[PDB]
Design a protein around this ligand. Sequence first.
Ligand SMILES: Cc1ccc(C(=O)N(CCCN)[C@@H](c2nc3cc(Cl)ccc3c(=O)n2Cc2ccccc2)C(C)C)cc1
Ligand SMILES: Cc1ccc(C(=O)N(CCCN)[C@@H](c2nc3cc(Cl)ccc3c(=O)n2Cc2ccccc2)C(C)C)cc1
Ligand SMILES: Cc1ccc(C(=O)N(CCCN)[C@@H](c2nc3cc(Cl)ccc3c(=O)n2Cc2ccccc2)C(C)C)cc1
Ligand SMILES: Nc1ncnc2c1ncn2[C@@H]1O[C@H](COP(=O)(O)OP(=O)(O)O)[C@@H](O)[C@H]1O
Ligand SMILES: Nc1ncnc2c1ncn2[C@@H]1O[C@H](COP(=O)(O)OP(=O)(O)O)[C@@H](O)[C@H]1O
Ligand SMILES: Nc1ncnc2c1ncn2[C@@H]1O[C@H](COP(=O)(O)OP(=O)(O)O)[C@@H](O)[C@H]1O
Ligand SMILES: [Cl-]
Ligand SMILES: [Cl-]
Ligand SMILES: [Mg+2]
Lengths: 302, 339, 334
Amino acid sequence: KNIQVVVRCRPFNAHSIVECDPVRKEVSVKTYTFDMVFGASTKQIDVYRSVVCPILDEVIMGYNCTIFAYGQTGTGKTFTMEGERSPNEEYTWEEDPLAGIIPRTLHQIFEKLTDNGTEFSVKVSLLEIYNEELFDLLNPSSDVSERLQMFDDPRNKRGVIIKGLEEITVHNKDEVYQILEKGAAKRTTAATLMNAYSSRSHSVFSVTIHMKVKIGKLNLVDLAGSENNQSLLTLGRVITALVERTPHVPYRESKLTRILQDSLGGRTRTSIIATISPASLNLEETLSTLEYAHRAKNILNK
Amino acid sequence: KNIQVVVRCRPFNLAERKASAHSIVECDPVRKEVSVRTGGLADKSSRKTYTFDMVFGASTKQIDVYRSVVCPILDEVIMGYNCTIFAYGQTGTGKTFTMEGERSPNEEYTWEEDPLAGIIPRTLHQIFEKLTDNGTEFSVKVSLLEIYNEELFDLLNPSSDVSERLQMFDDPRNKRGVIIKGLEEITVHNKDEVYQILEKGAAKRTTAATLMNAYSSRSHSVFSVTIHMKETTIDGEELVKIGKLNLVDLAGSENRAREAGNINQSLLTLGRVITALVERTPHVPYRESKLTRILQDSLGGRTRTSIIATISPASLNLEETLSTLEYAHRAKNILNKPE
Amino acid sequence: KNIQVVVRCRPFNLAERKASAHSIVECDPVRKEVSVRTGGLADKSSRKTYTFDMVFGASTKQIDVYRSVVCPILDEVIMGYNCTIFAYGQTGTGKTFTMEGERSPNEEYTWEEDPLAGIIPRTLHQIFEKLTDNGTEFSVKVSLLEIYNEELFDLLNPSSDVSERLQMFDDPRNKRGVIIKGLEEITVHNKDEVYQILEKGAAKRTTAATLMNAYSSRSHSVFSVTIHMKETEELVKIGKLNLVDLAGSENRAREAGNINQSLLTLGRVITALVERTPHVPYRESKLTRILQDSLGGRTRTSIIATISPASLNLEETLSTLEYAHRAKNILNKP
Ligand SMILES: Cc1ccc(C(=O)N(CCCN)[C@@H](c2nc3cc(Cl)ccc3c(=O)n2Cc2ccccc2)C(C)C)cc1
Ligand SMILES: Cc1ccc(C(=O)N(CCCN)[C@@H](c2nc3cc(Cl)ccc3c(=O)n2Cc2ccccc2)C(C)C)cc1
Ligand SMILES: Cc1ccc(C(=O)N(CCCN)[C@@H](c2nc3cc(Cl)ccc3c(=O)n2Cc2ccccc2)C(C)C)cc1
Ligand SMILES: Nc1ncnc2c1ncn2[C@@H]1O[C@H](COP(=O)(O)OP(=O)(O)O)[C@@H](O)[C@H]1O
Ligand SMILES: Nc1ncnc2c1ncn2[C@@H]1O[C@H](COP(=O)(O)OP(=O)(O)O)[C@@H](O)[C@H]1O
Ligand SMILES: Nc1ncnc2c1ncn2[C@@H]1O[C@H](COP(=O)(O)OP(=O)(O)O)[C@@H](O)[C@H]1O
Ligand SMILES: [Cl-]
Ligand SMILES: [Cl-]
Ligand SMILES: [Mg+2]
């Protein structure tokens, strides 16, 4: 109920081995049923208003939520969470139809919170988990190799502290672009230095809201490629345990699930977007991802 | 009070006639009520009643709509305010007839005199007449923007391609305002020039319709007149004023289905904005749709806003008709008075 | 340098013979040099000489300015780059003649074929002939902006009052672009629509001169052509060309102080671009903010400095050349 699992299939770029029916909420390659399904034609704005938008209402209530993008490389994970700029500087990013979830989300927050007329405060942070180590993508001064320290939080027994993690204040929607642009530059230095790692790292973006005093928080997680590990294995199980309420959820077995435990249980909503390729050679992988999403929340066909 | 919600019922069409539909809708102008028979061909007893600021039954004349709804607003606009009038409701119920109106067949009338002329031509004629009459020094600009499938188009630019999309930006001076880059505001010097500007706009609109799927029922249309006035009196006050009036013909309320889905969203947003402004709620979600964002500077601030909600009499429309009246009633909730 | 500076001296005309004047200016096209007799019998031997990228003397035809200046630039625009060509100099030294040109007496020719046409008409014709020949799909927009007393006006809007001022803003989509709220950009589908559009603009320019005194000598004129070109992977390339007829270089005295300001900072900006200074003061005038899109980048920029040969004009003439040399400093040959 509070954990939605949706699939989105991307456009190619001819042999189509998949198929998706939105009304019957089914993906056929072999057939699975989900909370929602998006076919190749599907558009960034659609994904946003169906999956993300309801979750952000909750976040604005003072809840803490998380949205994952899961899948292999080439399926639209970075496309879905981040997006691209349309050609010829035709659009502002707030209007760009090719803008992914993170931009739409930050735009939406300033739209909704400005409409409300109340004093509010916005904060973002972005961290990468690579080989069970945590790195801060928004700290301007730190070298790209500095690991962060995290430990359990004496005040919060759902929580941890990530020590020194930069929380950047976004004063207005405009400033958001500079912030994440530097982050992208840093992250491009980290990938060069360490083992061509963009497919191997987990991105945790976090926006936190202070409404003057209720606090919402949303974490937008772009996981490392699901093709073949541990952080992926552990999350399935944390998800499995949260679906059925089998006690002692194994949060402690990965950095990801420890960092997230606070949101992953509490009064919350959690979604994961499983991304798949239509193309011929991806087939083993598509099946893993649907199986994985199937394992996550098990929904029998109709 | 500055927000008025009214309903206008049209007569039957041929289709409802040939189709043996029966009238389910009753209008009582004096009590400002609309009743609908909700019980189909089985029950004649079931009725739902709504009350609004005014109700125009099927015999209502264009001029009647103009005098009650528009003139009080036009007075305000000439005084230097910025106001808005919407036509809301199901495709084929009269939004265009109301806003634009129609030529009387067999020639006869000038458009200035034609009893079938709607709000837009009557409004423009009166602007020129009223200001020419008090000796105001003034100028008039008109623009027409279509919001279609999430995109912006300009119908009064005669040179540009119907496929040309326009971009929206914040207005740096004003948090309530936007700028639509390249939207033409055409200066019209008299009532003839506005006839020819709109005659061309209609042709360009037909062209666009032919090009794009379900075009009139799927677009919002924003017609805007801006008036710059300077009133000068020897040995007296010199007043400068800027009036603005938006006449908005909304997309069909009946409801790709993502296209039909997205229309439905901006409609609900508009509804929420109106509800909030009647209620004086602090959260007015202006920024949740293009339409409401574009109209925010009119709707915010000191104005008059009216909605004309149009419906069919026919039984074959029951669901849509009820949905429309629920929408109107949700925008401004007036309590039924005892019978 | 993709900044080309050239100089054009027009012929000694009737009135200057009626003024019984003396031609003081000499152009070496081959040496690319201009020299002026500076002394008026004070020496009368005395000479100033300047070197440039090209120099066009009194006998230069319109087609020669087009070939050497405009063509290379057009080519770059059609590749998708923004460029700017300026005419700079004293009033009645030939800027309008150069940018616009004149109709041939008679009815001898059509403007398309008229040997007296200036840069603007030759440029539009060529854009239409070239992209049509190219066979791919394209569209052409034009706008004409006047900057008079640091206010913006739209000369191509038929309907609007010649006194309506426009407001400008940064374009949030890019660093160098601006938005001039309400500036019309008229789509032109063929060469014939161009003539109509510019003729209406001429009247509106004429009626606006009748109002605000000075004008064409006191205002900057910015003419922009924007071309959208479709390719195939399917792509749009976008070129833009600005043709800028600057306010007179000579110099109420208030606008005069200010015209000089922009012209001055325009100079500052050009120098900054030729010899690279870290911060180019684009923002220090309306004109340079507006031209910023076409100055930064891979761009061919060109300035055509116009001058009179006559003695009556010495002072102005030397400033102009000095202005041009200051903007890009080259060195004399043997
Ligand atoms: C509309 C749009 C979409 C994407 C971009 C873009 O390519 N990037 C760079 C990386 C995208 N793969 C933007 C971007 N960068 C990110 C960097 C990191 Cl480390 C994490 C997330 C993002 C991200 O979401 N974006 C997209 C974006 C665009 C505008 C505003 C916020 C976010 C930045 C120029 C701001 C630009 C404009
Ligand atoms: C008395 C009368 C009423 C309607 C018309 C009419 O049919 N049209 C075309 C649209 C029909 N739906 C007129 C008209 N066209 C418009 C085009 C656009 Cl894009 C937007 C609004 C209008 C519009 O309001 N009208 C009505 C009108 C009539 C006379 C003067 C001004 C406007 C034009 C001939 C001027 C003609 C005369
Ligand atoms: C071959 C030719 C050259 C000049 C003209 C001419 O005199 N004008 C008027 C302005 C003269 N200074 C033409 C013209 N007008 C302009 C008006 C403005 Cl506001 C800005 C530029 C021009 C301009 O460049 N021209 C020349 C021209 C001629 C034909 C086609 C395009 C441009 C118009 C009849 C089209 C006519 C024919
Ligand atoms: N829904 C979609 N619509 C259009 N293109 C898509 C979609 N999903 C993915 N793509 C394409 O995927 C490419 C980017 O792949 P990306 O998502 O960056 O890989 P990864 O998930 O490994 O980071 C882009 O060329 C983009 O066009
Ligand atoms: N109140 C009315 N009186 C007479 N004719 C009307 C009335 N309302 C609508 N019509 C006619 O009914 C048809 C549909 O109305 P129209 O306003 O054009 O549709 P829409 O609501 O889709 O814009 C048109 O022929 C119009 O002329
Ligand atoms: N290169 C030239 N060849 C022939 N005539 C010229 C030349 N340059 C200028 N003229 C003449 O000088 C006159 C006045 O200068 P003009 O062209 O109006 O420039 P400005 O706008 O600076 O006055 C024009 O009518 C034109 O005939
Ligand atoms: Cl604009
Ligand atoms: Cl030709
Ligand atoms: Mg309509």
